[PDB]
C-alpha cells in the first residue's frame, strides 16, 4: 500500500551518494566535489556570523515567504543592470532553497501531465526526475563534440524536429554543467527562435553566470527579442559566492510566469532561512558598490579559476586524456578512452564504463572523478562512457597532488 | 498555455503571504504568525556564528542530502530516548527545510491520485493544498467545543465513518495549532485503533512537542502498540529552539516509510543548509547533556510561556472575548463574537484601525466548514511582557 506514488516510480538515489561513500572508503585526492576545498570570500562568512549575532531578535525569525526584503531588493538592483530592465523586487524575483528549488518550483509550476520538456544532455542531474515527477515527458537531445567546450554542439535539424505544439518548456544551462560550454549568441538565437515559433517557456539555469573565462561572455537569453515574456532565469548564491552549503537561489522573470512558482513554493517550503538571506544581501550590496572593479568577486572568480583550469587541462593531456577546455565554470570533462588498454576494469561491476573507470581510478590510483554517463538518458548513455568529469576549484597543492599521482601512474 | 497545472488549479496566496504583507504595510503590534519578538537561546545563536566562522572549509559547503551527519546523530540520540527504540540516524531520520518540507515530502511521498487523507479541523493550513497537489482527496472532521483546549473534541462516530478502503493517511497535530489541544491517551488510541484496522499511515505533526503546560503531557503516537510501523513523526528546529528563521525540521519513522520521503526530498531541494544544521546539532548536543534540568530549554519553555498564556487569557476574557486556554503551545483562540468571512474582516480591521494583528481561524477550515471559525481569532503570546502589556492596553482602550 505504501509504495512510491506513480509519478515517482523507479526513483533511485543520486549518483552523489555512492561517490561520497567511495571517497570516504578510499580517501582519494578528490576532484569529484563541485565546491571549493578552501574558503569563500571572508566578507560573506563574516556577514553570516553578524546575522547570527544580530541584536535584532527578528534576524533569526521568519522572513517574507517570496524572499527576504533586503535580498530581493539587492537581486533586483543587480539583475536590472544586467538585463537592462527594471525588475520588480516583489513580483519578478522569487528566492528559493538553492537554484535546486527554483528549478523545482518552475517545473512543478509549469509542467502538467503530458507536457513535453526538452532537456539537453549531459543534463544537470535533477532535470529528468523533476520533469517526470510533474507528469511531463522529457525529450532529450545531446551536445556532441565536433578541444574547447565551444566544440560540443547540438544538431540543429535534430533540435528543430524535437519542437512541436506539445513542447511546453526547454531547459537550457549556460554556462553548462559539466562541459563549461557558454552558449554564443547564435546558439541562443536558435533556442529563442524555436521558443517563439512554438510558444515554449525557456528556463535558463545560469548559476555559473559569473564564471566565464576570457575571451567568452555570458549572454542572458531573457534579453533576446521577445524572450522576456517567456523566460524564467535561475541563479544561485552558493555558486555566486562559493558557499554551496548555504542553499539559497532565485528565479527572476515576468510576474505572470513567477505566479506559478509562487504557488508551488508557498506550499512546499513557504520561506527560506533568514540569516543566510541577510548575509547574501550584504554580499550583494558589497559587490554592487564595486561592480566594475577587478576585485569584485563576480569579476575576480574567473581569473582565479582560469589558472587552475589551465593546469588541469595540461596534466590531463599529459597522462593521455583529451580534455574539453571549458569556456566557463569549474568543471572539466576529459576523454579517457585512449587509457583503456592501460587500466583493468574487469572487477568493476557497473553497467557503464565511466563508472567502472572512475571507481577503478579512486581505488587504484587514489584520484576521484565523476561518471558523465549519469547525466544522460538511457539510450544516449554511450555518449558519456568515454569521459570523466573533474572539478578544478581546488587548492593549488591538491591540483599539484593530482598531477603527481598521474605522473607516477604513467611512469 | 501557461496557466497553473491541474494539481494547482484554483490556488491563491496563502494566509501567510497575505498577512505578512498586511503586517509590512501597517506595522501593527504583530500577534499573528508564531515567533518570539526577543532573542532565542544564546547557545544556538553562538553555534551559528561558530559555523560561519569555522576553520573547516567543509562547514559552509554542501552536506549530506538526507541530513548533516552531526545533526541526524543528535536527532537519533534524542528521539531514541523519547520513543524507547534505537532510531537509525541514516535511514529513519530525514532533515528538511522546516517542518513544512517534512510535511511536503511526507504527503507527496505517500499520497497518490485518489488516495483519501483525513484532516482534523481546524488544521494547520498547508495540509489541504499539499494533499490536493499530490492528487489526494482530503476528508475533514472538526474539533468542536463541548474553556480549555481539552474541551475541543471530535465525534468518534464521525471519525470512524471517515475510514474506508480508500483512506491512505490521517494527519494529526499535537500539540495543536491553532487551539493548543494536547491529545490525551484515549484520543491517541481512537486514532491508532482506526489506523491499524484500516491499514492507514498516521502523520504526526509534533512541532510544539516541548511546549506542553502542566499538568498535561505530550504523548508520541508512534509509541502506541503497533504504531511505529505506520507513523511518520515531524518536528521543527524553528519551534524547538525558537529560531523560526532557521527553517530546519525533520521526519522520523521506520525505514520503509522514510524511503518515499527521501525520494521526494532528493528531487525537491536535495540538501539543506550546512551551517544551520551544524548549529542545531550543537544545540541538541548541548541539551542532551542536561535533559532533566530546569535550565534545559525543552523543559524551561513551558514555564516561560505559561505565565504569558495566563496573562493573555485574562485580558481577553476582561475585554469580553471567551478564550480557549491552550494545553500547550503559544497560540490562543478566542471567541470575539459577543463584541468575505467575518474573522478576516475582524483581524484586518484590528490591524488597520488599532494596530493589533491576530490571525483569522477560518483560514484553517475546509470551505464548507469555514463558518465554524468565523467567530474566533488566533493570537500568539510568545512575546516580551512589555508587548503583552501593550496588547492588553490596546484592547482595554478599544473597549
Ligand atoms: Br550522502
Ligand atoms: Br565526491
Ligand atoms: Br573580504
Ligand atoms: Br555568435
Ligand atoms: Br535575435
Ligand atoms: Br578569465
Ligand atoms: Br518580450
Ligand atoms: Br502575521
Ligand atoms: Br548526498
Ligand atoms: Br487548497
Ligand atoms: Br508549565
Ligand atoms: Br510496530
Swiss-Prot record, chain B:
Positions contributing to substrate binding = 378
What main location does UniProt list? mitochondrion
Q: Name one GO biological process term.
A: biosynthetic process
Record-listed pyridoxal 5'-phosphate binding positions: 62, 99-100, 177, 208, 236, 247
Q: How does activity depend on temperature?
A: Optimum temperature is 60 degrees Celsius (at pH 8.5 and with pyruvate as cosubstrate).
UniProt keyword Metal-binding, yes or no: no
User: How is this protein named in the record?
Assistant: Kynurenine aminotransferase
Q: What lineage, starting at the top, does this entry show?
A: Eukaryota, Metazoa, Ecdysozoa, Arthropoda, Hexapoda
The gene that this protein is the product of is KAT
Amino acid at each position: 500500500k505504501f509504495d512510491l506514488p506513480k509519478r515517482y516510480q523507479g526513483s533511485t538515489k543520486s549518483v552523489w551518494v555512492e561517490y561520497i561513500q567511495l571517497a570516504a572508503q578510499y580517501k582519494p585526492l578528490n576532484l569529484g566535489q563541485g565546491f571549493p576545498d578552501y574558503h569563500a570570500p571572508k566578507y560573506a562568512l563574516n556577514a553570516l556570523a553578524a546575522a547570527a549575532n544580530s541584536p535584532d531578535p527578528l534576524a533569526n525569525q521568519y522572513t517574507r515567504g517570496f524572499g527576504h526584503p533586503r535580498l530581493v531588493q539587492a537581486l533586483s538592483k543587480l539583475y536590472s543592470q544586467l538585463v537592462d530592465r527594471t525588475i520588480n523586487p516583489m513580483t519578478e524575483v522569487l528566492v528559493t532553497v538553492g537554484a535546486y528549488e527554483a528549478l523545482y518550483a518552475t517545473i512543478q509550476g509549469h509542467v502538467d501531465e503530458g507536457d513535453e520538456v526538452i532537456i539537453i544532455e549531459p543534463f544537470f542531474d535533477c532535470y529528468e526526475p523533476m520533469v517526470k515527477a510533474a507528469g511531463g515527458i522529457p525529450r532529450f537531445i545531446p551536445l556532441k563534440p565536433n578541444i574547447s567546450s565551444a566544440d560540443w554542439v547540438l544538431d540543429n535539424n535534430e533540435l528543430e524536429a524535437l519542437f512541436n505544439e506539445k513542447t511546453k518548456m526547454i531547459i537550457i544551462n549556460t554556462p553548462h554543467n559539466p562541459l563549461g560550454k557558454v552558449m554564443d549568441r547564435a546558439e541562443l538565437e536558435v533556442v529563442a527562435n524555436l521558443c517563439k515559433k512554438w510558444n515554449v517557456l525557456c528556463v535558463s539555469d545560469e548559476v555559473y553566470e559569473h564564471m566565464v573565462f576570457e575571451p567568452f561572455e555570458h549572454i542572458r537569453i531573457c534579453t533576446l527579442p521577445g524572450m522576456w515574456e517567456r523566460t524564467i532565469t535561475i541563479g544561485s548564491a552558493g555558486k555566486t559566492f562559493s558557499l554551496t552549503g548555504w542553499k539559497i537561489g532565485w528565479a527572476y522573470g515576468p510576474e505572470a510566469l513567477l505566479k506559478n512558482l509562487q504557488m508551488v513554493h508557498q506550499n512546499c517550503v513557504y520561506t527560506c532561512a533568514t540569516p543566510i538571506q541577510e548575509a547574501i544581501a550584504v554580499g550583494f550590496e558589497t559587490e554592487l558598490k564595486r561592480l566594475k572593479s577587478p576585485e569584485c568577486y563576480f569579476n575576480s572568480i574567473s581569473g582565479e579559476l582560469m589558472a587552475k583550469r589551465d593546469y588541469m587541462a595540461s596534466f590531463l593531456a599529459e597522462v593521455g586524456m583529451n580534455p574539453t577546455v571549458p569556456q566557463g565554470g569549474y568543471f572539466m570533462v576529459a576523454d579517457w578512452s585512449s587509457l583503456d588498454s592501460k587500466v583493468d576494469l574487469t572487477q568493476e561491476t557497473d553497467a557503464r564504463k565511466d563508472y567502472r573507470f572512475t571507481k577503478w581510478m579512486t581505488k587504484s590510483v587514489g584520484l576521484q572523478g565523476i561518471p558523465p554517463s549519469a547525466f544522460y538518458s538511457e539510450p544516449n548513455k554511450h555518449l558519456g562512457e568515454d569521459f570523466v568529469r573533474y572539478c578544478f576549484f581546488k587548492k593549488d597543492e591538491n591540483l599539484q597532488k593530482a598531477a603527481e599521482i598521474l605522473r607516477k601512474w604513467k611512469g
